[PDB]
Amino acid sequence: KAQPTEVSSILEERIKGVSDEANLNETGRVLAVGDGIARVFGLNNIQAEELVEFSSGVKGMALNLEPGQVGIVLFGSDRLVKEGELVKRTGNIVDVPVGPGLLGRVVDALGNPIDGKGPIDAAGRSRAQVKAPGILPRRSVHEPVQTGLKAVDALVPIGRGQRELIIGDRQTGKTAVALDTILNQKRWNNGSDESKKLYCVYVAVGQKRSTVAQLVQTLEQHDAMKYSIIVAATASEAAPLQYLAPFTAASIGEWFRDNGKHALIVYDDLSKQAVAYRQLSLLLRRPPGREAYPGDVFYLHSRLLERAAKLSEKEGSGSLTALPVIETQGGDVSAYIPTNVISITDGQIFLEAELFYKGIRPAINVGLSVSRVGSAAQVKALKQVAGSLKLFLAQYREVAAFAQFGSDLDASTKQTLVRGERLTQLLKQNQYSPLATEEQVPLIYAGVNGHLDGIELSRIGEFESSFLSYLKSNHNELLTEIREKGELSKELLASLKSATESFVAT
Amino acid sequence: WVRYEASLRQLEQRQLAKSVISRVQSELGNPKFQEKVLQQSISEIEQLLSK
Amino acid sequence: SVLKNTSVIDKIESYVKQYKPVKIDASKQLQVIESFEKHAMTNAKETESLVSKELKD
Ligand SMILES: Nc1ncnc2c1ncn2[C@@H]1O[C@H](COP(=O)(O)OP(=O)(O)O)[C@@H](O)[C@H]1O
Ligand SMILES: [Mg+2]
Question: SS3 for A432?
Answer without folding.
Answer: coil
